[PDB]
Amino acid sequence: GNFTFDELQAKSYLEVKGSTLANQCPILGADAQQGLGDVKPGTFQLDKFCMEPSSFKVKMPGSKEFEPSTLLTRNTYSLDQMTGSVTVKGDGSVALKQQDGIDFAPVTVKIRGGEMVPFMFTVKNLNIEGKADGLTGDFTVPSYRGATFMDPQGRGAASGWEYVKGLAAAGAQEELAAENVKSAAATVGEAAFAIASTDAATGEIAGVFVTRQLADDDLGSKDPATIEIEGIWYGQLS
Amino acid sequence: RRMPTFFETFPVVLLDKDGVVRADVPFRRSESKYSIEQVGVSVTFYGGELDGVTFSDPATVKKYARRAQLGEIFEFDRATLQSDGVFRTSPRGWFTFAHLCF
Amino acid sequence: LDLFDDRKARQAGFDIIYEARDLDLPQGVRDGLAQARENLDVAKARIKEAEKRIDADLDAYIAKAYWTEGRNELRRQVGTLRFDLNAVADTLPKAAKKEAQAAKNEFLAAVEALDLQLRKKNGDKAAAALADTKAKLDAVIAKL
Amino acid sequence: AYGDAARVFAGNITNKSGFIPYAGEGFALLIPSKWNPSKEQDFPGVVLRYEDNGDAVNNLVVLVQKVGKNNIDELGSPDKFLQDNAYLFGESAAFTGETLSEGGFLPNKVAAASVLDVQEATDKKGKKYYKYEVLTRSADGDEGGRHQLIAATVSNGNLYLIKVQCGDKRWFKGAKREAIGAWDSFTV
Amino acid sequence: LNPMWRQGMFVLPFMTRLGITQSWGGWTISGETASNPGIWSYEGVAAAHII
Amino acid sequence: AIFRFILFFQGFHNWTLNPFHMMGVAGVLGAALLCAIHGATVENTLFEDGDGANTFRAFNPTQAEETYSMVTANRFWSQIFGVAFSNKRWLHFFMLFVPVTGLWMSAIGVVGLALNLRAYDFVSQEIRAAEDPEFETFYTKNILLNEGIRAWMAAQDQPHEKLVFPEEVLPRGNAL
Amino acid sequence: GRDQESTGFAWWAGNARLINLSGKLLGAHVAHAGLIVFWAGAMNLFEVAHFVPEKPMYEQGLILLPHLATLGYGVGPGGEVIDTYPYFVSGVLHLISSAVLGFGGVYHSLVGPETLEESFPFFGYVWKDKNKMTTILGIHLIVLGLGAWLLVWKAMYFGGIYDTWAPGGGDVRIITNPTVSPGVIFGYLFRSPFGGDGWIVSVDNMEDVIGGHIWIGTLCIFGGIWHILTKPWAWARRAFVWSGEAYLSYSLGAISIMGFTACCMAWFNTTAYPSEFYGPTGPEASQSQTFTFLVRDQRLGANVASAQGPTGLGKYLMRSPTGEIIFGGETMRFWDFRGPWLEPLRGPNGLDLNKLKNDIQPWQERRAAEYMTHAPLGSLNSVGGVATEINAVNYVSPRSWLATSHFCLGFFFFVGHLWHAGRARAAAAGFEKGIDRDNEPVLSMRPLD
Amino acid sequence: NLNGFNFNQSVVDSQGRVINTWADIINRANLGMEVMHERNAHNFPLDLA
Ligand SMILES: CCCCCCCCCCCCCCCCCC(=O)OC[C@H](CO[C@@H]1O[C@H](CO[C@H]2O[C@H](CO)[C@H](O)[C@H](O)[C@H]2O)[C@H](O)[C@H](O)[C@H]1O)OC(=O)CCCCCCCCCCCCCCCCC
Ligand code: CLA
Ligand code: CLA
Ligand SMILES: CCCCCCCCCCCCCCCC(=O)OC[C@H](COP(=O)(O)OC[C@@H](O)CO)OC(=O)CCCCCCCCCCCCCCC
Ligand SMILES: CC1=C(/C=C/C(C)=C/C=C/C(C)=C/C=C/C=C(C)/C=C/C=C(C)/C=C/C2=C(C)CCCC2(C)C)C(C)(C)CCC1
Ligand SMILES: CC1=C(/C=C/C(C)=C/C=C/C(C)=C/C=C/C=C(C)/C=C/C=C(C)/C=C/C2=C(C)CCCC2(C)C)C(C)(C)CCC1
Ligand code: OEX
Ligand SMILES: [Cl-]
């Protein structure tokens, strides 16, 4: 980060263009009270909610420990401009729900062995609740590829060949029955958010997040891996 | 509709006795008007190994309609010689090719 | 397929993109210049909305030092202001339209100065130019 | 031999309206002059079908179906009539699965139809008509949607229906004129 | 259970004996993850010999 | 009509992937290269047989001495390219030999293609792409292009087959 | 005239017979200038007589009229042609001046002095006299600087020039504060030619154009004065070939570079080449198509921000490789586009979701639709659309014509520069007519390995 | 984007019907190889790039 919302809005597009400052989340000023702060209990409208990751770890199927990864797709992995609702109770319990906005970004990383691991970074339909220092929840992870995506041999779920066009002699291809079927089914993930600062003067919040989800499976043709994503987040309450 | 000699791959369409299309295996399954699932086509075998056996599962019906393009459906042993699955040519073709070049 | 009721989309402006691409229609109809001249109510409403938006939003943006937002606002909805002013002033007698043209030219020079100051990021100069622009816009509106 | 001289130095074009009139069994319409006859019968009761030379997506079809009612209103409300005849836009029967990665589509749906306009009107003779205007979109985005124009009526105990299809890509490039002309000329 | 010597490697143990354990592919002869392999990896040494 | 013939040969036979056609195109392009390079080299190593800037008039067909410097041409092309001709007879025989061999190889390829003996596919690549839905090369893209060409040209190019194809069986990409 | 008997140059190379004839060369140059002015005037008259007001300028195949529109002549707010008389005036003036120039060239080429080195010493010259050539170069540099200043005066005092970025729509503005900052001027000149940077083609406001023209006028005048008062130094005498053909080759290379730059500017620029008079550019059409499809699908009740495409990247909005919010699809390569109708919806970090969800204007939508349908695609017989379309539309973009023609001209003049530089270097050395049989240079060198 | 000659639907009979030509067969082949050049890189109907 290292820039606030006002500082970001004080620039020009030609000054931000190319500097990778559009892939970052704003931080709060010195007026931000620590913890939950002085927020009046109630339900607020969430706006400008963004999450900037700071590390990716991959646990290959068959391993019990996460591993570091190297990003391959440059600065395209920040979710931003999401909108929703935030409710604060008198005790301190808070509930966060995400409705719209850019809440998904495909990401590809490489691991120690040299295997590229695509995954679908998203917090779509986020539903978390808990205290200020911890918010456990879940989200839905849509398929990496759509139903109309066609594989290199022209096989797709809702459009494409249902078999292998090249192997004409093999009438049924019972050996290839596994790869001829495509399913774009969705899955779910888990999240654990936290709140570190809050400014009731302008209705701004910030904290950290840790999420766990699954990598892609090439439309049901692979065993997905588990990926842990951690970083910071920011949002505005109004 | 039987697959002509020219085509390496041919679409699967089903015609009635008047030559009008009635069913096919669609490439774009978002909207379909002659889909086998819609029409409800079934296959029955007369004579041979599968005499008297009727298949109504759409996947099996599609699989058998795919092999009807090649002509008479047969049973092959693709394990003795590890056949890859692409058609070859006969001594007729080899002789003709070699002697034209010569 | 599955039916959806979207009959109210046309009342929301669904045919604007299809009419703008109709090569049979004249260019004035495609660009919307013919409709505004035929119906001056649209021009008057656009002028009033542009004036109100200029006042409130320019004050807010210059106060908080939002230069990009201020310039975009100056050319987002106000983008038809010159054409609307010309159309309104073309329906006036010779002397009245001459005075309106002079006032409009002065106002446009004021807006140009305000945009230059917003680009150069001078808060006090931009505020003074904005006050002058508001005065000139009020004068030209009263002239029409 | 024929003996007919060539039309040298002729300043008149035989046909320039872009439409060719057609006289059928109980109906008449103006078919676009650049469309060729087709041998496909996708819906029950097809008695006429024409498709464009350039793109086969643009086509029209006329259905004459047998019903008991002698009036179109007895088949239900225009909304109910359109709901009953929803097979005219096709069905996603071949796609059997669940998905959540479509652009602006309901879950497990790869196609949708937007009813842009409905209308009920009577001709000069005095026969009621049901006019529809739909835009069906696909998951992949074929041609940016398809425009369907439907005009249905009942005469002598039979239902007469016409559906004119035109891809959006051709629709906004100037081919909407032929489709609208064929749709508006349907007389029974 | 699948060490260097079970795969019939001849020159790789001789490279490893003198202190080369990392590769440009990200892996390490001990099963860990490579940290800045540098010029002197297995591939680097092979390329140096070719040059 | 010849353009349609060429496109048909691409769509149905994969004629671009035939080694005999590759030899033919290599021969044709090499013949053009040889023609241009020989013309330029002869014209830029001439001898000063006149006083006018128009050098076309300093020649006589019945003369004995050659009109250009073979030694200078050989040295130039030896220092520029690495190899050069030192025999005029060998030069001109090579000029004759290249396009004739290219065209003969192309003819043998077309003779082979007459019986649908086309080098159409690589079986290993097809099997790998079938087993692994992530493997893609330019060869598979060319295969898909050929399939599209065949499917969309078959109906009109061959009226005798009476192919009626519903719009939903023709292969097609997303939004295009 | 002359003949091959006393010159040695054939009829197909006959213009080389007047290399050392100053009067005839001057006559030929004056006649050619008259021809250029004649074409300008005649083409302007032809284009002004075939112009209808119901269609935009770029839809009628005009290339000279948009040049006068950008100077603020006969145009109004929004980019609508209002008056036509100034175009007629310009064409008539050009035609009559061409008549005068043609008479002068014919006189100087037919009956004028053949070699003006004895009767007119001021105008006489020798190709090998460096001082005289440098003096002539300085005089013409002063003239060009005066022309640049004349362009500058138009945008300041004589009504101004059309500004497509003016607040409240494009209109003929007056440039009061040109950018004369050395850092700004040097930034355009020494910029990379690749994407994003764009070299000098990326100039995005009229203030920079006017400031650069002030700079170039001052530089040209100062350089002309410098060359009139000086002569080439030793390091310059040691590096160049001093002959008429050599000077011609230098000029040919310079103008080939100029032609390539003009082609690129016509294809890519939007400030000096407003889309109101030239039509949309390449990227502009794709951005407009994505914008209008987003608007239409949003009107049908869809979530554009969260919509996912077949590949899983985003149907309408995706993220640029540096982080900016851009359009989705194949138009992800054109995210460097910046146009007057799209900038108001763009925030500091790219496109603004709320702005394009609640504050999209009908004029913006109309501009997007018009630039989508009039894409710069066509055929040689002027058939609009992609190569797999039908014969329905007779349209080819004015940007395509200028770009293609000027690329062809630039390449051919580069080839001409190569030819003439080689010939000049050979002829000055003295072996342009062939090798000497008596003394062949190669025979005196040691054989290679 | 200054393509070659486009003689598509050029020959038209007296009543307006289109008479095909070798150019139209070439157009059919082009349409075949156009919709399959990039199967998933397009979201909108026009390939303006
Ligand atoms: C000093 C010596 C040179 C030093 C540097 C040499 C580097 C060499 C690197 C190796 C590769 C070769 C060169 C590649 C050039 C690629 C040019 C390019 O991608 O683009 C060219 C650029 C265009 O830049 C574009 O500029 C655009 C301008 O932006 C803005 O433009 C307007 C501004 O108002 C609009 O607002 C618009 O919306 C907005 O985008 C965008 O930025 C684009 O992204 C950007 O690509 O043009 C320009 O730089 C202007 C013209 C440049 C020269 C001519 C190019 C064409 C001819 C090639 C050579 C000759 C070939 C024929 C002879 C062959 C035999 C010898
Ligand atoms: C761009 C135009 C152009 C121009 C301006 C010139 C100019 C010139 N040429 Mg070149 N030339 C050109 C193209 C051009 N040429 C081309 C394309 C070729 C290849 C065919 C040649 C080949 C060539 C040769 C072979 C020779 C020249 C020579 C000459 C020069 C002598 C003139 C003369 O003796 O002719 C006398 C000709 C005539 C009496 C005919 C008169 C017709 C007039 C000039 C027509 C213009 C009139 C116009 C319709 C009305 C204008 C009047 C006004 C009031 C409007 C002259 C400076 C000569 C030279 O080298 O001089 C030393 C010569 O030997 N030229
Ligand atoms: C019309 C075009 C023009 C032409 C053809 C010439 C031609 C010539 N110039 Mg002149 N000159 C011009 C305009 C022109 N000049 C202008 C406008 C100025 C004012 C700056 C000068 C000032 C000038 C000086 C000070 C000198 C010459 C010299 C020379 C000769 C050397 C050739 C050369 O450039 O070396 C080949 C080129 C190079 C080695 C590299 C040059 C490219 C520069 C460094 C690029 C960067 C530009 C520079 C930093 C300027 C600032 C940028 C701008 C934004 C302010 C040659 C006769 C020399 C001489 O003989 O004088 C008698 C010399 O010393 N010229
Ligand atoms: C810094 C240099 C930059 C350019 C470097 C160019 C390097 C290429 C030089 C190739 C020379 C080979 C000549 C063999 C044969 C040889 O020794 O040539 C030498 C031969 C000798 O001619 P003579 O007149 O002496 O022959 C007398 C007669 O009696 C022969 O029977 O001259 C030629 O035929 C010239 C034609 C060269 C034709 C080149 C063919 C193209 C190369 C193929 C590239 C394949 C690449 C595969 C990569 C996987
Ligand atoms: C020397 C020479 C040459 C050349 C020449 C030349 C290049 C010339 C030019 C010339 C020129 C360049 C001329 C011009 C002229 C012009 C004129 C004579 C004009 C006139 C005009 C008028 C008469 C107008 C009228 C009008 C008006 C006023 C208004 C509107 C209408 C009108 C248009 C009617 C040659 C090649 C043969 C070769 C040999 C030598
Ligand atoms: C107006 C304007 C502007 C401005 C501009 C300017 C100011 C420019 C300048 C320019 C310049 C200032 C240029 C320059 C150039 C140069 C060159 C291009 C050079 C070249 C050289 C050469 C080629 C050389 C060679 C050689 C060598 C190397 C060696 C020895 C020999 C010789 C000498 C030959 C701007 C953009 C702002 C904006 C728009 C408008
Ligand atoms: O990348 Mn290679 O190909 Ca020239 O078009 Mn648009 O982009 Mn894609 O599609 Mn078609
Ligand atoms: Cl796209």
UniProtKB/TrEMBL annotation, chain B:
Annotated compartments: Membrane; Plastid, Chloroplast thylakoid membrane
Residues the record lists as binding chlorophyll a 8: H99
Family stated for the protein in its record: Belongs to the PsbB/PsbC family. PsbB subfamily.
Quaternary structure, from the entry: PSII is composed of 1 copy each of membrane proteins PsbA, PsbB, PsbC, PsbD, PsbE, PsbF, PsbH, PsbI, PsbJ, PsbK, PsbL, PsbM, PsbT, PsbX, PsbY, PsbZ, Psb30/Ycf12, at least 3 peripheral proteins of the oxygen-evolving complex and a large number of cofactors. It forms dimeric complexes.
Function as written in the Swiss-Prot or TrEMBL entry: One of the components of the core complex of photosystem II (PSII). It binds chlorophyll and helps catalyze the primary light-induced photochemical processes of PSII. PSII is a light-driven water:plastoquinone oxidoreductase, using light energy to abstract electrons from H(2)O, generating O(2) and a proton gradient subsequently used for ATP formation.
Designated name of the protein: Photosystem II CP47 reaction center protein
Organism of this sequence: Chlorella sorokiniana (Freshwater green alga)
TrEMBL record, chain C:
UniProt keyword list: Chloroplast, Coiled coil, Membrane, Photosynthesis, Photosystem II, Plastid, Thylakoid, Transit peptide
MF term (GO), any: calcium ion binding
Organism: Chlorella ohadii
Location relative to the cell: Plastid, Chloroplast thylakoid membrane
UniProt family annotation: Belongs to the PsbQ family.
GO cellular component terms given for this protein: chloroplast thylakoid membrane; extrinsic component of membrane; photosystem II oxygen evolving complex
Keyword Chloroplast applies: yes
Coiled coil ranges: 33-60
Protein name as catalogued: Chloroplast oxygen-evolving enhancer protein 3
A Gene Ontology BP annotation from the UniProt entry: photosynthetic electron transport chain
Coarse class of the protein's main subcellular location: plastid
Keyword set includes Plastid: yes
Automatic annotation (TrEMBL), chain F:
GO biological process: photosynthetic electron transport in photosystem II
Annotated positions binding a plastoquinone: H38, F85
Annotated TM spans: 20-40, 90-115
Subcellular location: Membrane; Plastid, Chloroplast thylakoid membrane
Bilayer topology: Multi-pass membrane protein
EC number, UniProt record: 1.10.3.9
Catalysed reaction, written as an equation: 2 a plastoquinone + 4 hnu + 2 H2O = 2 a plastoquinol + O2
Protein residues bound to chlorophyll a 2: W15, H21, S106
Listed GO CC annotations: chloroplast thylakoid membrane; photosystem II
Principal subcellular localisation of the protein: membrane
Binding site for Fe cation: H38, H92
Organism superkingdom: Eukaryota
Keyword list, A-Z: Acetylation, Chlorophyll, Chloroplast, Chromophore, Electron transport, Iron, Magnesium, Membrane, Metal-binding, Oxidoreductase, Phosphoprotein, Photosynthesis, Photosystem II, Plastid, Thylakoid, Transmembrane, Transmembrane helix, Transport
Function: Photosystem II (PSII) is a light-driven water:plastoquinone oxidoreductase that uses light energy to abstract electrons from H(2)O, generating O(2) and a proton gradient subsequently used for ATP formation. It consists of a core antenna complex that captures photons, and an electron transfer chain that converts photonic excitation into a charge separation. The D1/D2 (PsbA/PsbD) reaction center heterodimer binds P680, the primary electron donor of PSII as well as several subsequent electron acceptors. D2 is needed for assembly of a stable PSII complex.
Family according to the record: Belongs to the reaction center PufL/M/PsbA/D family.
Something else known: 2 of the reaction center chlorophylls (ChlD1 and ChlD2) are entirely coordinated by water.
Gene assigned in the entry: psbD
Automatic annotation (TrEMBL), chain G:
Cellular compartments annotated: Membrane; Plastid, Chloroplast thylakoid membrane
Binding site for chlorophyll a 4: H29, S251
A GO MF term: metal ion binding
UniProt-listed GO biological process terms: photosynthetic electron transport in photosystem II
Binding locations of chlorophyll a 1: R2, N15, R17
InterPro entries in UniProt: PS_antenna-like, PS_II_antenna-like_sf, PSII_PsbC, PSII_PsbC_sf
Transmembrane spans: 25-46, 58-75, 87-110, 133-153, 210-229, 250-268
Binding site for [CaMn4O5] cluster: E343
Keywords annotated in UniProt: Acetylation, Chlorophyll, Chloroplast, Chromophore, Manganese, Membrane, Metal-binding, Phosphoprotein, Photosynthesis, Photosystem II, Plastid, Thylakoid, Transmembrane, Transmembrane helix
GO cellular component: chloroplast thylakoid membrane; photosystem II
Binding site for chlorophyll a 6: Y107, H108
Binding site for chlorophyll a 8: H213
Binding site for chlorophyll a 3: N15, H32
Annotated residues for binding of chlorophyll a 10: H417, R425
Residues reported to bind chlorophyll a 7: H140
Membrane topology classification: Multi-pass membrane protein
Positions with a binding annotation for chlorophyll a 9: W226, H227, W233
Binding site for chlorophyll a 2: N15, W419, H420
Pfam families listed in its UniProt record: PSII
Positions with a binding annotation for chlorophyll a 5: H67, Y273, H406
Main location: membrane
Subunit structure: PSII is composed of 1 copy each of membrane proteins PsbA, PsbB, PsbC, PsbD, PsbE, PsbF, PsbH, PsbI, PsbJ, PsbK, PsbL, PsbM, PsbT, PsbX, PsbY, PsbZ, Ycf12, at least 3 peripheral proteins of the oxygen-evolving complex and a large number of cofactors. It forms dimeric complexes. PSII is composed of 1 copy each of membrane proteins PsbA, PsbB, PsbC, PsbD, PsbE, PsbF, PsbH, PsbI, PsbJ, PsbK, PsbL, PsbM, PsbT, PsbX, PsbY, PsbZ, Psb30/Ycf12, at least 3 peripheral proteins of the oxygen-evolving complex and a large number of cofactors. It forms dimeric complexes.
Family: Belongs to the PsbB/PsbC family. PsbC subfamily.
NCBIfam families associated with the record: psbC (TIGR01153)
